[PDB]
Amino acid sequence: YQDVNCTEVPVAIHADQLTPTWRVYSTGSNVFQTRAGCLIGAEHVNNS
Amino acid sequence: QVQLVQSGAEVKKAGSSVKVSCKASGGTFSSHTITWVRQAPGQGLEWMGRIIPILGIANYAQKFQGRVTITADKSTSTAYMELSSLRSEDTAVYYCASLQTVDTAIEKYYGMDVWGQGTTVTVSS
Amino acid sequence: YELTQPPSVSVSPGQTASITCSGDKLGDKYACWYQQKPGQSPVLVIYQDNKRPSGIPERFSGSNSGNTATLTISGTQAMDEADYYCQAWDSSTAVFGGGTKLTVL
Amino acid sequence: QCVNLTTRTQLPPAYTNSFTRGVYYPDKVFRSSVLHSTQDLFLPFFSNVTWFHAIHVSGTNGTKRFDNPVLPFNDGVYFASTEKSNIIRGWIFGTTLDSKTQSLLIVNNATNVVIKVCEFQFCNDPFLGVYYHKNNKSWMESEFRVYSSANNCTFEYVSQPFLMFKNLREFVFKNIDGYFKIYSKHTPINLVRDLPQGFSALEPLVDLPIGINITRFQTLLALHRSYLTPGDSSSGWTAGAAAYYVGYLQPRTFLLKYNENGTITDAVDCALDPLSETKCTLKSFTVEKGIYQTSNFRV
Amino acid sequence: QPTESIVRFPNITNLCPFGEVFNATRFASVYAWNRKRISNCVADYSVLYNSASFSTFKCYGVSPTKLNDLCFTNVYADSFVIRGDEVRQIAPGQTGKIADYNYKLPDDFTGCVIAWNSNNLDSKGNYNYLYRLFRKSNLKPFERDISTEIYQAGSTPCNGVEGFNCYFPLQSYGFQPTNGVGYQPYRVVVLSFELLHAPATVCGPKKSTNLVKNKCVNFNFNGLTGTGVLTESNKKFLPF
Amino acid sequence: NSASFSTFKCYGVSPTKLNDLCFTNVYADSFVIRGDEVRQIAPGQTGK
C-alpha cells in the first residue's frame, strides 16, 4: 500500500464490508512498514 | 381424518324426493374427494358418481344418468344430493367414502380409505 | 370392463386361498380389491396393486397377471369372514363385481 | 390442502462453503478463445452457502423433521438440488406471500412446468404430495398442497419441465429491472459429500417478464405419505434427506474465459483476493513475476 | 462490392389479435395495468401511424419507419387510461399522480408510445368508470401496486375512520363531452421491446430471400445488416 | 402533490432534488400571462 501507514490500514480498508480473504491482509505477523508504504504478506529478512 | 358421520335410517313414502348427505366433522372438507357407493343385499356394490368440493366437477355413472343432482358447497362444509324417480327395486343402503385427492385423473392413485356406517332407506307404499 | 367371478369359495382354515378376478382387459389396468365384513363397513385392504395400507396385518397379497388379478391369503383365521370386491377405475368410472364370500370350516 | 408440519428448534448456521460455482452466461452472444470481463450479479467464489437438509433422520429409529423456512431474496439467489429421488419440485417467491401482492409459483411435474405469478396466500409449510403409483415410478403424480386461492391471477406459462451418481443441479434466480430470468445446469457428481472440486458453466433456460416485487422466497418439496395416521395431525411424510443449497448473489465483476468450443473452462473473481484481482486488471489468467497495480472493487 | 443482398428471416404468417391490444372494448386501469406478451406475431407497425382511425402516434424509442425490417425478441405492450391532461406528463420523470404512483417508464427505454382520444367510449354522462386518484409512496419502473388508504385531511391520521379533520373528499365523476380537452380520458398503449440480440420470434413484414454461400454478399439476418463472405464453421452454437 | 399546478418544470435542478437543499435566499417572481405564452417563459427563448 503506497504511502499508507500500517496502523491506518484497518480503518482505510473499511473492514465492515470486506470478505475474510481480504481481512487476513489487514493483520497478522507478516506485516512490515517500509518507506515505500506498508507491505503485508512478505516476511522481512536481515540478509541482503 | 374424516368420520363421514351421517343421519340414521329414514322412513318415507314411495315416489317422494330422497335427500341424503354425509358430514365430516373431522378433517378439512376440501382436499378429499367424496364419493358414494350403494350397498344392496345379494346384488354387490353399485357406483353412481363422485364430487370434488374444491374443483366442483362431478362425474356420473351409466345407470344413474339424470336421476341424481349432486352438489357440494365449501361454505356449508357438507355434501348433499337430490334423488327422485326411485323404485322399490332401487332401495338399498348408501355409503359415502373419501379418496384423498381432488383431481379428475388422480382418483386412480388411491382406494377408498374411509367408509360410512351406512344409511338404510325404506320405501313405504 | 365387465366383471364375472365365482359366486363363492370355500377353504379350510390356515390354508392358502387363491381368488381370481377375471374380466376383459383387466391386466395393465391396475385393479384394486376391497374387503367387507358382516356387520362392519367395508375397509381398504388392497390398494392400487395388491398393496396393503398401513394398519392392516400382513395377510393379503397377490399379483396382477397379463389378463387376470390374483389374491393370496396367508394365515387365514376365523375372523377372516368377509366379502371381497375387485374394482378398477376404468374410463373415468368405477365398476364393482358380484364379489366372493369366503367360507371357513 | 395445507397442514402444520412445524415443531422443532431451528439450527441457525446450517451452512457450508461453495468453492467455485454460480458462474453463468450473462448474454446470448457466442464467444470463443477470448476472455471477457462482465459486471453483473454473481455468487462469490469460495462463498458461504446455506446447507439446509429439511429431513433429519437421526436417532435409534429415526425421524422426519421438516424444515423449509422462507429466505430473503436480496436481489439474487443461487440454488442447487443435488437430489437422488427427484423430490424438489420448484420454488415460491413474493413479498409477504399472503393475499397482498403477486407471488411466483413453480412446479415441476412429469411433463408440465407450472408458472403462476398470481395473488394467493401460502401456508407456513407449502409442499407437494407425490405417490409412486404402485411403485411403478412411471405416473409419479403430485398434489396442490401449496396454496388455497387463485384470485387476481395475471401471468401463466407452461413448457417442457425443467427437471428431466448424484444429479447435481444448479439454478440462478435474478429479478432485475422487471425481468425474471431462470438459469439452470444439470451435472452428475459421484461424490456424496458437499459441492465438488470442479467448475461448470450455467446456461440460461427461460426469461419471465413477471414485473413484480420479490423480497422473500421458499422451496417446494415433494413428500410421500409413508403412513396415514387416524386422527390426522399432519402425519409425517418421507422424501429422503431433502438436501438443497442456497446462495446469495452480489454485484461484482468476473473474468470469463471461453474455450475453442465456446464453453467456459474457468473464471476468476475480481474481489476474492489480490491474486485473482491482479488477473482481472491484466485481463489474463497467467500473471508473470513482478509487481502490479490493482483498482478498488469493494462496495 | 457484394454481388447481391440476402435477407434471412423467420417464417411467420399468423397475425395475433392486435385489436385485442388496440380495439379492446375495456382497458385495464392505470394503477393495475395489463401486460400482453407479443410473440410469433407478424408485426405490422405500418398500419398505425398512417391509419385514419388514430391521430396520435407519439413514439419515443426509435424511428417508426424502420420498424418494418427488424426482428424483435419478447415484445410487450401495456394498455391504460389516464384523465388526459397527463399525456404530456408521461415523460421519464415528472411530478404528478401517475409518473411515480401508477406507472414509471425506465430512462433507458426502447419503444414507442401510442395514444388516442376516447370520448364516445368513456363519456356520454356515464360515471361508472373509475381509476386511482391518489397514492402515498413511489414505485420503481415497470412496477404495480394496489392499496387504498384515506388521505389525511389534517394532522390526525385517519386510516379508514371518519372523525375530526377527516371526512369524505371524493366526488362523483362528471365525464361529459362538454368538458374541455385534457379532462376526457385518453386510451394510451405503449409498445415495449429490447434489442439485446437474442433469438427472435417477432419480425416485420419483410420477405426473406434465398441464401448464397462463399461469396461477398450484403447479408441481413434478423435485421442485422452487414457485408462479408458467408461460409461454414465447425464451432457449435448453444440452442439459446 | 397538488393538481393546482399543471405546469411545473424546473430548468437548472431536478424538481425531486429541491427537498435536499435548504436555501435561505430564493427570488420569487409572480405575474400573470396569457396561456399561449407560457412556453415563451424559458431561458433564452425569443418572444414578445
Side-chain angles (χ1 to χ4, degrees):
Chain A
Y1 305 126
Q2 296 85 16
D3 294 322
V4 174
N5 205 5
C6 284
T7 72
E8 291 152 37
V9 173
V11 183
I13 65 177
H14 313 108
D16 282 359
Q17 301 86 22
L18 305 184
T19 59
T21 57
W22 287 100
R23 295 302 329 287
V24 297
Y25 286 99
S26 58
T27 186
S29 54
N30 278 350
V31 172
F32 179 43
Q33 174 70 332
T34 59
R35 181 179 311 92
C38 194
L39 186 63
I40 297 169
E43 188 214 330
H44 178 254
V45 68
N46 295 114
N47 299 116
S48 307
Chain B
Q1 173 55 256
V2 69
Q3 301 295 108
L4 296 174
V5 67
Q6 67 288 22
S7 61
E10 56 276 23
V11 65
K12 56 191 290 302
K13 303 183 186 299
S16 50
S17 299
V18 168
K19 201 166 192 177
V20 302
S21 171
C22 294
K23 179 262 287 181
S25 72
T28 67
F29 189 72
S30 67
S31 305
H32 298 88
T33 297
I34 184 156
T35 181
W36 289 61
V37 183
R38 208 187 76 201
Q39 174 55 266
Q43 300 296 328
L45 281 297
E46 200 71 27
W47 188 78
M48 67 179 186
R50 71 207 177 71
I51 181 162
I52 314 189
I54 189 70
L55 277 296
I57 311 308
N59 310 141
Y60 274 41
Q62 63 193 359
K63 184 264 288 183
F64 298 79
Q65 284 294 330
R67 61 173 82 258
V68 192
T69 309
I70 188 156
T71 317
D73 195 359
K74 65 186 286 186
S75 70
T76 66
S77 310
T78 304
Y80 64 96
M81 294 182 286
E82 177 53 271
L83 295 167
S84 60
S85 306
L86 287 165
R87 278 82 65 192
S88 293
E89 303 293 299
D90 206 342
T91 295
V93 193
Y94 291 78
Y95 286 71
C96 58
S98 160
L99 283 155
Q100 197 55 220
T101 183
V102 296
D103 280 329
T104 298
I106 316 309
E107 295 294 329
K108 187 72 181 69
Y109 263 75
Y110 318 86
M112 293 180 183
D113 185 65
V114 181
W115 286 66
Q117 58 260 23
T119 312
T120 187
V121 69
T122 185
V123 174
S124 177
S125 56
Chain C
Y1 179 48
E2 49 269 19
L3 269 294
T4 304
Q5 52 93 45
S8 172
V9 68
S10 299
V11 72
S12 295
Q15 277 199 342
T16 313
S18 183
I19 309 302
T20 58
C21 166
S22 56
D24 189 2
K25 187 65 173 65
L26 287 179
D28 204 284
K29 265 294 187 179
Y30 289 156
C32 319
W33 289 43
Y34 291 168
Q35 180 182 60
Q36 187 187 40
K37 288 169 185 177
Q40 286 83 21
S41 293
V43 293
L44 182 70
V45 297
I46 289 289
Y47 82 88
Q48 294 174 38
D49 270 332
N50 299 115
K51 215 169 170 184
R52 160 174 52 266
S54 66
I56 304 299
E58 280 212 34
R59 299 151 82 173
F60 313 92
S61 294
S63 294
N64 189 1
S65 72
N67 213 17
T68 312
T70 58
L71 188 77
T72 311
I73 304 298
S74 68
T76 307
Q77 296 173 349
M79 70 98 69
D80 268 319
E81 278 179 2
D83 205 82
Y84 301 160
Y85 289 96
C86 58
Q87 63 89 12
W89 187 248
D90 190 1
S91 299
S92 82
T93 53
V95 63
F96 282 95
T100 185
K101 182 66 71 63
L102 184 62
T103 302
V104 176
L105 185 65
Chain D
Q1 311 92 341
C2 277
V3 288
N4 288 357
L5 308 169
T6 177
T7 307
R8 80 201 153 262
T9 310
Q10 298 220 33
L11 182 64
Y15 62 77
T16 65
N17 190 317
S18 86
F19 302 150
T20 286
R21 318 211 81 69
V23 175
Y24 61 98
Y25 294 99
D27 50 0
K28 316 299 291 302
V29 308
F30 170 89
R31 300 168 181 155
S32 66
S33 301
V34 55
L35 285 74
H36 211 93
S37 67
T38 73
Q39 182 143 47
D40 219 293
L41 269 297
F42 282 114
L43 187 78
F45 271 67
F46 296 82
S47 183
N48 272 10
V49 290
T50 305
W51 187 35
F52 291 165
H53 285 276
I55 296 290
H56 263 298
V57 181
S58 64
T60 67
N61 270 15
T63 182
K64 294 304 217 301
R65 173 162 156 164
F66 192 63
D67 197 78
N68 58 342
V70 291
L71 285 73
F73 202 79
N74 285 300
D75 291 331
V77 188
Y78 159 80
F79 199 97
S81 277
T82 180
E83 70 207 0
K84 192 143 73 203
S85 62
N86 196 4
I87 51 175
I88 299 98
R89 317 300 204 109
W91 301 267
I92 282 157
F93 307 81
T95 64
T96 187
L97 285 70
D98 186 10
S99 301
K100 293 317 301 178
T101 78
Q102 309 303 114
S103 292
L104 192 153
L105 188 153
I106 293 155
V107 167
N108 283 314
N109 64 37
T111 79
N112 272 319
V113 60
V114 184
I115 308 284
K116 279 178 176 174
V117 168
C118 298
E119 185 179 1
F120 49 102
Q121 61 270 64
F122 293 100
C123 47
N124 292 15
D125 55 354
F127 76 105
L128 180 151
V130 65
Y131 303 79
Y132 290 107
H133 211 62
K134 300 81 155 194
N135 315 290
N136 291 118
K137 305 170 182 176
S138 60
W139 292 38
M140 58 157 197
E141 200 269 336
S142 293
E143 197 177 333
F144 293 100
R145 305 183 96 111
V146 176
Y147 61 89
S148 302
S149 307
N151 289 318
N152 294 11
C153 184
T154 302
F155 182 76
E156 210 166 271
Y157 177 102
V158 177
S159 293
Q160 189 77 33
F162 296 97
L163 294 174
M164 44 72 70
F165 63 91
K166 196 67 204 73
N167 197 329
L168 165 55
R169 299 194 174 76
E170 318 188 6
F171 304 70
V172 170
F173 304 157
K174 161 156 46 52
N175 169 266
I176 194 164
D177 63 358
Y179 293 99
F180 197 76
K181 294 183 287 293
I182 299 94
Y183 316 81
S184 305
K185 186 77 190 318
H186 178 208
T187 304
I189 62 176
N190 164 274
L191 270 285
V192 76
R193 297 284 74 78
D194 304 335
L195 318 190
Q197 279 291 295
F199 178 55
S200 75
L202 195 154
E203 298 147 10
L205 263 182
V206 62
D207 174 24
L208 301 171
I210 68 181
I212 58 164
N213 186 1
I214 298 164
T215 61
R216 310 216 311 287
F217 83 97
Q218 194 167 6
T219 310
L220 290 171
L221 298 170
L223 303 177
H224 318 71
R225 195 66 165 276
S226 183
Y227 63 92
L228 191 154
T229 191
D232 290 319
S233 58
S234 313
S235 164
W237 309 66
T238 182
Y244 69 88
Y245 299 72
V246 175
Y248 276 15
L249 308 169
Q250 70 294 350
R252 289 218 295 243
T253 67
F254 287 2
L255 196 71
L256 283 71
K257 163 157 186 214
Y258 296 77
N259 59 4
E260 190 67 23
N261 313 116
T263 312
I264 315 186
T265 59
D266 61 358
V268 293
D269 186 0
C270 303
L272 179 64
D273 76 325
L275 180 56
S276 311
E277 179 174 347
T278 302
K279 275 150 182 181
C280 287
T281 189
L282 293 176
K283 269 180 183 47
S284 71
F285 268 53
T286 43
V287 175
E288 193 59 25
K289 181 178 76 171
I291 186 169
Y292 310 89
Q293 293 179 356
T294 63
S295 303
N296 197 341
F297 276 105
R298 279 139 278 156
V299 297
Chain E
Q1 297 286 340
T3 53
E4 65 262 26
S5 170
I6 296 90
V7 170
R8 307 291 287 159
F9 267 50
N11 49 2
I12 56 180
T13 183
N14 54 297
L15 272 73
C16 64
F18 292 93
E20 190 277 331
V21 187
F22 293 90
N23 279 128
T25 59
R26 183 68 269 174
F27 288 172
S29 56
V30 71
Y31 60 88
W33 46 272
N34 188 359
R35 185 185 215 105
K36 178 163 165 46
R37 175 168 184 277
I38 307 174
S39 175
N40 290 314
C41 290
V42 183
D44 198 302
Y45 312 90
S46 290
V47 308
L48 297 171
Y49 64 91
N50 54 35
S51 58
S53 59
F54 313 150
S55 177
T56 294
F57 188 64
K58 65 179 72 66
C59 178
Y60 182 76
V62 295
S63 293
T65 71
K66 282 171 175 286
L67 275 171
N68 285 254
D69 55 352
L70 294 163
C71 276
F72 282 101
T73 181
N74 290 318
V75 179
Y76 303 114
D78 299 330
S79 299
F80 36 88
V81 182
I82 52 175
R83 200 172 65 253
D85 48 352
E86 297 89 2
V87 171
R88 174 231 61 61
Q89 205 253 341
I90 310 164
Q94 288 296 324
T95 51
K97 57 158 67 65
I98 63 174
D100 304 332
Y101 299 152
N102 295 125
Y103 194 79
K104 173 47 151 179
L105 283 163
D107 56 354
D108 202 338
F109 170 73
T110 305
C112 294
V113 178
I114 298 85
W116 62 90
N117 165 50
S118 65
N119 270 349
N120 292 318
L121 310 164
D122 288 10
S123 306
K124 295 199 291 294
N126 215 12
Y127 318 135
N128 53 12
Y129 319 123
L130 303 99
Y131 67 100
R132 190 151 297 283
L133 191 66
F134 181 79
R135 211 187 163 284
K136 289 181 177 291
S137 62
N138 285 356
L139 60 88
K140 295 299 205 59
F142 297 141
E143 197 205 337
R144 322 194 272 275
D145 193 285
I146 45 174
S147 177
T148 311
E149 284 187 354
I150 306 304
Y151 164 52
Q152 301 174 3
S155 177
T156 54
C158 51
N159 210 24
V161 178
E162 210 285 330
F164 206 69
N165 288 118
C166 275
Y167 45 88
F168 212 72
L170 301 170
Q171 186 145 319
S172 296
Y173 274 116
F175 299 138
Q176 285 177 351
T178 58
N179 283 271
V181 184
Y183 182 76
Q184 312 286 347
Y186 292 93
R187 282 180 163 181
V188 184
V189 176
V190 59
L191 260 176
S192 173
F193 47 76
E194 75 292 24
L195 279 170
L196 61 88
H197 283 347
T201 70
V202 177
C203 301
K206 189 141 174 56
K207 177 252 185 202
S208 167
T209 70
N210 189 6
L211 165 62
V212 72
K213 194 165 72 66
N214 206 344
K215 183 162 59 34
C216 194
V217 286
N218 208 355
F219 56 82
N220 185 355
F221 303 140
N222 298 112
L224 188 153
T225 188
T227 308
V229 176
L230 308 185
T231 67
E232 303 304 78
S233 66
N234 291 318
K235 54 179 60 170
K236 299 288 103 175
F237 267 36
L238 279 77
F240 61 89
Chain F
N1 274 356
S2 303
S4 298
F5 313 120
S6 77
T7 289
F8 183 15
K9 178 254 281 181
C10 200
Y11 288 100
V13 300
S14 289
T16 187
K17 298 279 178 177
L18 273 287
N19 212 356
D20 296 331
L21 314 162
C22 312
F23 272 116
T24 301
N25 178 7
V26 176
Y27 287 151
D29 298 331
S30 175
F31 54 96
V32 193
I33 54 174
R34 187 192 163 186
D36 290 334
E37 280 71 354
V38 70
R39 56 143 299 288
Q40 180 183 158
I41 308 299
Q45 266 182 22
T46 57
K48 283 290 308 319

